[PDB]
Design a protein around this ligand. Sequence first.
Ligand SMILES: *[C@@H]1O[C@H](CO)[C@@H](O)[C@H](O)[C@H]1NC(C)=O
Lengths: 49, 441
Amino acid sequence: YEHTAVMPNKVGIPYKALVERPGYAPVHLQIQLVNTRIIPSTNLEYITC
Amino acid sequence: YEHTAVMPNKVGIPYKALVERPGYAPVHLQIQLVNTRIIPSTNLEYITCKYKTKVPSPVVKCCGATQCTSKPHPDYQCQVFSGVYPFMYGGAYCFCDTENTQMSEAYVERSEECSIDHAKAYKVHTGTVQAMVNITYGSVSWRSADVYVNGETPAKIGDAKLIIGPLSSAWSPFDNKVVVYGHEVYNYDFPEYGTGKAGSFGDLQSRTSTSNDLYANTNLKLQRPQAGIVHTPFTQVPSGFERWKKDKGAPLNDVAPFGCSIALEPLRAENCAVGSIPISIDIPDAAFTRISETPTVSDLECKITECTYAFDFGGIATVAYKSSKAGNCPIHSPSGVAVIKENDVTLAESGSFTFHFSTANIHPAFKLQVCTSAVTCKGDCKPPKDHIVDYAAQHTESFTSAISATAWSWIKVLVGGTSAFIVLGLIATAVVALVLFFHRH
Ligand SMILES: *[C@@H]1O[C@H](CO)[C@@H](O)[C@H](O)[C@H]1NC(C)=O
């Protein structure tokens, strides 16, 4: 059963929801981000020293 | 006690009802069709298959001539070719160079494959309709028997005498002419026996696969043998059976409406969901219990806790109750709004029980009958999640099933608004007309 939602982009703050499937008891869902990493693409132009 | 009703002609969907016998508690009745078979009356017209051309040894008459005679063979051909000078491994066969004649003969016969690879052309007329039913009543478990859907022949199922009426529709998927090839049936208007044309399906026709009288209509033409060669060349239109097998098209098994399944032994259409079936079942008297002998149910309150108008039993409801004797109690919803999954429940002195139901209505409102009592259930239902399901719906959708309370409010506002606005004009006209009358008087 697919559950779709929007959670805030916060680390350490868990997102809580009840997965309500018709005819079945709700299943508690908890999604928490441990870390988020933005990894850009880099090209070395030159080295200075 | 005889119970008469009409159930839909739907295979796999059970028909549920309560048998209400005055003086006795209602007995729950459930009838389910196991299969439905339309068995038309068929008459084999002829058998068609690929032809085989039999060519006897030609008569090579050296220094003379011979004459062809007719023979009782299918598509028999005989032609005398004069002026032949055949050669063989041993040299020139004949001495004379011109007064020399070859008589060629050829005829059509059934191929060996015709014993296995052939099509049967049948004339189809109306015939017997049969069905198999699965029935329960009271405490008696499932019983089944094969019955005739004609409304005259009764069947004894678990000591109950069942009469199944004729189908409300005489529709049948077979035309007046069908061609049976292998496991497939084709609604093909085959040519009558003796009128088949070369290159078409009926080019070869036989009354039976073992018949000694074969009709063959091919353009079998004897050609002149090549110079110096002893052979019987001929030209013939390619077999119309092989041509048909390429062009036979879609069989009735693939295009029959209403999901009919076609079977060949005997030829029949199965599980056609067409119309409804009147029924009459006589429930044994021993199955009925007096009112005073059954538990009395009161203080009923029905709460729908979940509901989706899905094809399955997407609804769940809780019924609170109080009853004496704390016995078993039939449960049924006579209204078509919702179909109840449970047939009966066990009741205590007081408590509640739950049941499941299927409904197409966005706001279900149905009467639930509880042995000797009844309660009204109301609620709201959510749309289903699955767009496509692999099973047929357990409920019947009505015209007003989709109308929500919001839509009903708008309908009442629109209808009430226009009606009230028109009525105002009519009243205003009548009032002013009366005022003018009193102006004169
Ligand atoms: C009748 O329905 C019951 C349901 O439990 C099933 O076990 C039984 O096989 C059915 N009858 C036939 C003939 O299939």
